[PDB]
RNA sequence: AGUAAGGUCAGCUAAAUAAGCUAUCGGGCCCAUACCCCGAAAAUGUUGGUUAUACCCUUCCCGUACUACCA
RNA sequence: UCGGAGUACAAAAAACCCUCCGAGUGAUUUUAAUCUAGACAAACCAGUCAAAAUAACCAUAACAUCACUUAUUGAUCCAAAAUUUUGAUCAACGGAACAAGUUACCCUAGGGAUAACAGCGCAAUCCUGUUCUAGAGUUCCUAUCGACAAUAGGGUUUACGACCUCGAUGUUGGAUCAGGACACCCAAAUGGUGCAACCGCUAUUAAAGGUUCGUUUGUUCAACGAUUAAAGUCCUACGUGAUCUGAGUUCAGACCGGAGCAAUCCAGGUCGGUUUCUAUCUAUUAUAAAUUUCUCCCAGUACGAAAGGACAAGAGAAAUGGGACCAACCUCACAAACGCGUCUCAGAGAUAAUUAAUGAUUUAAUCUUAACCUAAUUAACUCAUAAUAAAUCCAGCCCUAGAACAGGGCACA
RNA sequence: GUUUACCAAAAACAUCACCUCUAGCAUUACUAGUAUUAGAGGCAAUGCCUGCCCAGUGACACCAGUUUAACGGCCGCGGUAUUCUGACCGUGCAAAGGUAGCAUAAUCACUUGUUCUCCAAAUAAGGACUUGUAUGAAUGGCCACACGAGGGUUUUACUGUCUCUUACUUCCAAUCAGUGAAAUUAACCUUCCCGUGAAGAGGCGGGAAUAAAAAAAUAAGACGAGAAGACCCUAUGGAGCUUUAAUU
RNA sequence: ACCAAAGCUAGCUCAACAUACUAAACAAAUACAAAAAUACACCAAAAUAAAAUAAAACAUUCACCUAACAUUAAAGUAUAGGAGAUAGAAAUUUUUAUCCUGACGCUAUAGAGAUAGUACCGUAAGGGAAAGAUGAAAGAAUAAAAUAAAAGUAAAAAAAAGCAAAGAUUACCCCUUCUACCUUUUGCAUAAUGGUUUAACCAGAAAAAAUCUAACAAAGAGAACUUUAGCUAGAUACCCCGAAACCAGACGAGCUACCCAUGAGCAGUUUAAAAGAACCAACUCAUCUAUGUGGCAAAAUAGUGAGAAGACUUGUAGGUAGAGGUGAAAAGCCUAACGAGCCUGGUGAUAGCUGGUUGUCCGAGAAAGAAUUUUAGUUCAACCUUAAAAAUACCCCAAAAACCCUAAAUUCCAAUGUAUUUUUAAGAGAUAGUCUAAAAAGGUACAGCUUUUUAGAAACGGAUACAACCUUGACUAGAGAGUAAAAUCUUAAUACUACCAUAGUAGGCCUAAAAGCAGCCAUCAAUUGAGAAAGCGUUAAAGCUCAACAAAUUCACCAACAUAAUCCCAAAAACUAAUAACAAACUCCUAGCCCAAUACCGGACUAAUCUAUUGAAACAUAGAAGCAAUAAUGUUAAUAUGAGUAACAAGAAGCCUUUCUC
């Protein structure tokens, strides 16, 4: 395992990726 | 290279608080053990040579914040009080044991 | 790399009672120099801590020394 | 081994050959008793506190103190002392009453739980490209380079990890055969230049073919002699030992220098030293349609002050490679085989970088991930074309056909 | 001459020579002998030589002491003749401070030292230079004749070693007849590629290829077959050797 | 249909009784070199057993281990022990004779090794087997009866595709779905281990404390003891194979090392030479290379080599024996393995190390804290299993827990929700851990890296494959149904083009020269309009361009980044209506026998043997054990595969045994 802070854009857990994709910003239309 | 730090291994002494508020304790039970003065003894609470707090009477353990008036013979403590400004008073935490059982009762032993 | 280990007068040694020899400086002896005789000066590598210092420890620096093996 | 602080942020506990401080006792007198409720802590052994009660002394008196106060320490047995009490750098500190070296002459039981060779992970080291311009370049950032720094990727080196194998994954270099990548050494096309020409420097595109012979060293590497269009970088178990080699590493023998009192040891050298296998399975056992150099010529022309000195186009001769053949020469004591000898070797399409025409978004211009048409243009590659071609005589004999099986002849011979 | 019978035949051991050491002597060795003798060893003919050191250890004397052809040892720091070098000088420690000789050697590393000759080209070979701070004098130094199935280099002559292979015979080989073995083998109806995976797939995943059998060949893979890895570590598992380990 | 299969005797084991214990045979020959009638002799002998092991090492010690005279008790007591391991008496007690003896012992891989210590392997001590089946009669072999059932073959070779099978199907394949089995590990289809296949044989054993059942009970027991509900009896228990070694006693010098006896060889050639001289054979060694590598050979053949009158080869026979012999030291040789021979005995040596451990089904089910010549192991604690008792366990609000700053959050506790928890009595396993998320440390803010704390997981579904990620309360049957995780991810972007320039003035200063354009200073001013200058340029000037005139009016910040080695990698698709659909070990539906698992522990049944009674076309209730084999490079025997493959041999003709070729 890697440290908390790295240099290579640490890959997120797959469950967290879904969280980052469902909480996106939708500008008003 | 080579290690320069030595002797860093030592088990903990389990210093901490034993009886929380509301626990029913008997005489002789150790309320808490400490390294420095973290909780000062209060009413019905003794103080051993190793700064441990043990209850003197059977009852309920209570914790309280009170004022601190040091012993005049303690030169270091009285000096700290002397330098305090006029509007301030020291506050310390104390451990109390409110007695539950009465001292005794009167019973009829003989009716002559 | 690691470990070991030392620095003291200008120089080399022994003690920490900082001494001894030599060099250096002044004078005497000789025609002059040297030898020789007389007198004086001279230092504890470095920083900090060692009741206080020194022989100690620590820091800095120079330099010395051993080992670096089985596939 | 024992204590304190951080890692362990707020009850406890909590690790590393983790980061920093210490202890293996002194000073002093207040010389600190006996007996018992109840608890903290803890695997155990150990460690800690403690009311009441009794005695001591103000005649209803128990915390020895200070130095971060926390650590200042050792179990049985056994031994000595009065019976009270004492005894270990037993420090390997839960402590065997008392015991070192070497083994490459080694043996046995096991481990991929654990190293060397190989793969894999990772990218410190290494390699390749880009971003940023201070400057070097007489002036001029980027013709050629570019410090202090930014960013992406390759997996060749030495390391790091110890994940698959120690009831075996045989280990350097050569010999044979080479498969592949392009970050291209040569061959082809092109942009830029501090490119006149010649010789160069640099960048883009292209992997079908090619990349020499020798002296020394076991050598890969490197130096040197001669040459070539060029003598590329790297992967493939740093390809390839059921194909070969064993000079070197890497057993047993033996000297020299050194270390050790010795036995023996040295990524220090030197001489010598067994390289096994009858192929079960998988895989595999021939189509062709060339490439480069040199000469002559263009031409002492183009280009230049001169000195120097071209490209394209044309013609010719060789070499390597592919595939064939004996009239001669040569090997040749078979009527054949064989090289040193002889013979042959090709058209069309198609492209990458790049160059040019027409022209709109933008009524200019502009090669166009704008349309239509069209031009100059690397190598691959594809194809024209060439080879193969008759179903069903076959006992026997012959054969320039052949392991067997097949194949060609056997009417005039 | 001798040795590791069965991976080393050598530079190892032995050897004539030289030297050290221990013994004054009788019925089974030495020896039917008596110091010109006989044992316990070292080093290796010959020739020139074998330097200095009894402090330590050992031996002898068993007391002082004596012995290195007994085990072993045989030095720093600083200054000094224009410069370089260091005859010399100061000072210290030792039982003495490496003397003669030879030398980039079979001699740690530096190392492919430097230079000359040999070659078109020399990490080789020979001859010199030489601190070799780790050469060195019977654990022997140095020189030479002869000798060597030892190790290295050169010239000449030869040759398929090689540029570069070819022809022809015999034993194998292939067909026919006879006899007929071995290692090996979980079951196999036993493909290729990329990816995945105990980190190198005939078997998994995504795709490709695909009538079934026989005989003869080449050795890339089946982490091929063979030996419960010789390397390395572990085991309160062994053994051989040595001594300043412990006990005796 | 072959190969094969079946049988029940031979005899054996353990006792008892018992004479009292080297049999049978000894005509002749037997310790000369045994089995050879016959000549002056010598003859004989003893010295404590040691060690493998246990103490987890090993030095004092270690039962039995040569010689005891027994049994019931005293007693595992007194004592003896690195006072550790373990070793262990006595005083004093008990014991009635003879017959009733046979078998819950085996039946040819069993039982003795035995048909036999014979074949056979070793010089010797020693080691040491396999092997039998007809019937009343084989004086019934044109002979007869019986299973025709192991692996291996034949009858009957094979037809795309795959752990060889399942779901099936009218149909063998074709289709769909599945990474062999044990052992060992954090994790194995692994290219980690073992097995060709078949039959036979081969591995859990003990009763102190305890639980279950029963007798009798303040007492129990058929003496000796235990007793504040105990005593007596029964039942429930703890494996196999393997080292290198160590000690004692025997047998080996016919090979080899050396020696003592007794013999025998060296021709020719060259030299005054029989000189450890020279050339070269016999003879003896074995340098180099190639064949050979289960070979002709457990060290050879072919070529080539060294010595060859000596420190030489060689025959016969004798001597030295393992704490040793021997050695021109190679740690050589002493009967094909010598850092110390072989054989037997001690020996079932001992291994924390490797391998193996045999019927069905069911219940619950553990990843490591502390010491340790200890980290390859053990003994405690935690956790867990079986049985039992008891009352509180988890969740847990307010209050409460430090002083300079400090997050997620813990400790403690009523309600409530829910049945868990503690204690007592018996216990083993485990104590070698992997990843993901989170807080840290070492490292390169590297590793599928390493050290701790909190939490999770180890699907037969999904992420194409996949131990660790996500969905999931693991029963059986059905040709029913609803759902969960989840299947192709984004952008791949940047045109900026008119027209037009004249004054003071080379501004001062500066410099060799500084004319908007090294620097310093100032930065005013003509013209409607234009900076003592924004850029380029010049040695300095000149010159070009940009700001300002006018003309005129789409929009214009920013967003560009190379490549790897056997062959690219599902095929393909921009719109017919989507909080769709299809999709599990989840959950409903119909019936039930009503919920997974490795080490350890608990329970219920059961195949095949013998015995006690039943049973009498093969069983029932009980009591007993040599009580079950897909796995130990397992043992013996038999079969295959490799394979009809590797490899082996006889000169020719004829008138047959005579002539020819070598
Ligand atoms: C390295 O030398 C080792 C062998 C040691 S014993 C010759 N290599 C093994 O593969
Ligand atoms: K210890
Ligand atoms: K790394
Ligand atoms: K291995
Ligand atoms: K190429
Ligand atoms: K195969
Ligand atoms: K020829
Ligand atoms: K444009
Ligand atoms: K020889
Ligand atoms: K002496
Ligand atoms: K030389
Ligand atoms: K020789
Ligand atoms: K092969
Ligand atoms: K293996
Ligand atoms: K194993
Ligand atoms: K197994
Ligand atoms: K004999
Ligand atoms: K033979
Ligand atoms: K162990
Ligand atoms: K100017
Ligand atoms: Mg993590
Ligand atoms: Mg700790
Ligand atoms: Mg701490
Ligand atoms: Mg507690
Ligand atoms: Mg009191
Ligand atoms: Mg003890
Ligand atoms: Mg300890
Ligand atoms: Mg402790
Ligand atoms: Mg003990
Ligand atoms: Mg050796
Ligand atoms: Mg072994
Ligand atoms: Mg491990
Ligand atoms: Mg390899
Ligand atoms: Mg490696
Ligand atoms: Mg591998
Ligand atoms: Mg990378
Ligand atoms: Mg510049
Ligand atoms: Mg980077
Ligand atoms: Mg590993
Ligand atoms: Mg194997
Ligand atoms: Mg090669
Ligand atoms: Mg190639
Ligand atoms: Mg390119
Ligand atoms: Mg080119
Ligand atoms: Mg290789
Ligand atoms: Mg090789
Ligand atoms: Mg070979
Ligand atoms: Mg190979
Ligand atoms: Mg060699
Ligand atoms: Mg030597
Ligand atoms: Mg040789
Ligand atoms: Mg060699
Ligand atoms: Mg074949
Ligand atoms: Mg072959
Ligand atoms: Mg031309
Ligand atoms: Mg236009
Ligand atoms: Mg064609
Ligand atoms: Mg024909
Ligand atoms: Mg000789
Ligand atoms: Mg030999
Ligand atoms: Mg030899
Ligand atoms: Mg002499
Ligand atoms: Mg000599
Ligand atoms: Mg010699
Ligand atoms: Mg010598
Ligand atoms: Mg001498
Ligand atoms: Mg003396
Ligand atoms: Mg010389
Ligand atoms: Mg010499
Ligand atoms: Mg050298
Ligand atoms: Mg050489
Ligand atoms: Mg040569
Ligand atoms: Mg020389
Ligand atoms: Mg020397
Ligand atoms: Mg000597
Ligand atoms: Mg010497
Ligand atoms: Mg001579
Ligand atoms: Mg010679
Ligand atoms: Mg020549
Ligand atoms: Mg045949
Ligand atoms: Mg097939
Ligand atoms: Mg693969
Ligand atoms: Mg597949
Ligand atoms: Mg597939
Ligand atoms: Mg064949
Ligand atoms: Mg074949
Ligand atoms: Mg396989
Ligand atoms: Mg291989
Ligand atoms: Mg193998
Ligand atoms: Mg093994
Ligand atoms: Mg070894
Ligand atoms: Mg241990
Ligand atoms: Mg041992
Ligand atoms: Mg032992
Ligand atoms: Mg012994
Ligand atoms: Mg001693
Ligand atoms: Mg023991
Ligand atoms: Mg044991
Ligand atoms: Mg005994
Ligand atoms: Mg005693
Ligand atoms: Mg039998
Ligand atoms: Mg049987
Ligand atoms: Mg059969
Ligand atoms: Mg199928
Ligand atoms: Mg798997
Ligand atoms: Mg493993
Ligand atoms: Mg386990
Ligand atoms: Mg396997
Ligand atoms: Mg294994
Ligand atoms: Mg096998
Ligand atoms: Mg009992
Ligand atoms: Mg012993
Ligand atoms: Mg013995
Ligand atoms: Mg003999
Ligand atoms: Mg003769
Ligand atoms: Mg001779
Ligand atoms: Mg011999
Ligand atoms: Mg021969
Ligand atoms: Mg030969
Ligand atoms: Mg020949
Ligand atoms: Mg000869
Ligand atoms: Mg000779
Ligand atoms: Mg004898
Ligand atoms: Mg001996
Ligand atoms: Mg001899
Ligand atoms: Mg030797
Ligand atoms: Mg040796
Ligand atoms: Mg033998
Ligand atoms: Mg055993
Ligand atoms: Mg552990
Ligand atoms: Mg336990
Ligand atoms: Mg609360
Ligand atoms: Mg509660
Ligand atoms: Mg463990
Ligand atoms: Mg772990
Ligand atoms: Mg890890
Ligand atoms: Mg690990
Ligand atoms: Mg956990
Ligand atoms: Mg799946
Ligand atoms: Mg369910
Ligand atoms: Mg303008
Ligand atoms: Mg590029
Ligand atoms: Mg595809
Ligand atoms: Mg469904
Ligand atoms: Mg269960
Ligand atoms: Mg496990
Ligand atoms: Mg029964
Ligand atoms: Mg059984
Ligand atoms: Mg069986
Ligand atoms: Mg095997
Ligand atoms: Mg078996
Ligand atoms: Mg049989
Ligand atoms: Mg066969
Ligand atoms: Mg074959
Ligand atoms: Mg044959």
Nearest 5°: phi and psi at B92? Answer: -135, 160
Residue B18 Cβ < 7 Å to strand D: yes
CA gap B112, A4 in Å, rounded? 87
Task: Write the DSSP assignment of B47-85 as a string of letters.
Answer: --TTS-EEBSSSEEEEEEEEE----TT-HHHHHHHHTS-
Q: Are strands B16-17 and B30-33 parallel, antiparallel or unpaired?
A: antiparallel
* Distance from residue B58's CA to the centre of ligand 93 (Å): 63
CA gap B70, B74 in Å, rounded? 7
Determine the 3-state secondary structure of B18 from DSSP: coil
**Which residue(s) pair with B55 in the sheet?**
B45
Assign residue A18 a region (left: φ > 0; alpha: ψ between -120 and 50; beta: otherwise): alpha
Where do the structural domains in chain B lie, given as residue ranges?
1-112
Element (H, E) at B88: none
Residue B60 Cβ < 7 Å to strand F: no
Tokens of B33: 């053990």
Give the contacts of A8 (CB within 8 A, at least 6 positions apart). none
Tokens of A8: 């290579």
Selection from B70, B61, B68, B74 nearest residue B26 by Cα? B61
CA gap B32, B16 in Å, rounded? 6
Task: Return the CATH class of domain B1-112.
Answer: mainly beta
Element (H, E) at A22: helix A14-22
- Chain B 25-84 contacts with nucleic strand C (CB below 7 A): none
* Distance from residue A9's CA to the centre of ligand 69 (Å): 71
């Amino acid at each position: 395992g890697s440290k908390a802070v790295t240099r290579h854009r640490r890959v997120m857990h797959f469950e967290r990726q879904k969280l980052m994709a469902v909480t996106e910003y939708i500008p008003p239309k | 290279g080579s290690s320069k730090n030595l002797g860093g291994k030592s088990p903990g002494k389990r210093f901490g608080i034993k009886k929380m508020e509301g626990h029913y304790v008997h005489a002789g039970n150790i309320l808490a053990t400490q390294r420095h003065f973290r909780w000062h003894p209060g009413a019905h609470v003794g103080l051993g040579k190793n700064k441990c707090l043990y209850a003197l009477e059977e009852g309920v353990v209570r914790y309280t914040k009170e004022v601190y008036v040091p012993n005049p013979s303690n030169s270091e403590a009285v000096d700290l009080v002397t330098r305090l400004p006029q509007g301030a008073v020291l506050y310390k935490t104390f451990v109390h044991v409110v007695p539950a059982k009465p001292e005794g009762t009167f019973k009829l032993v003989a009716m002559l």
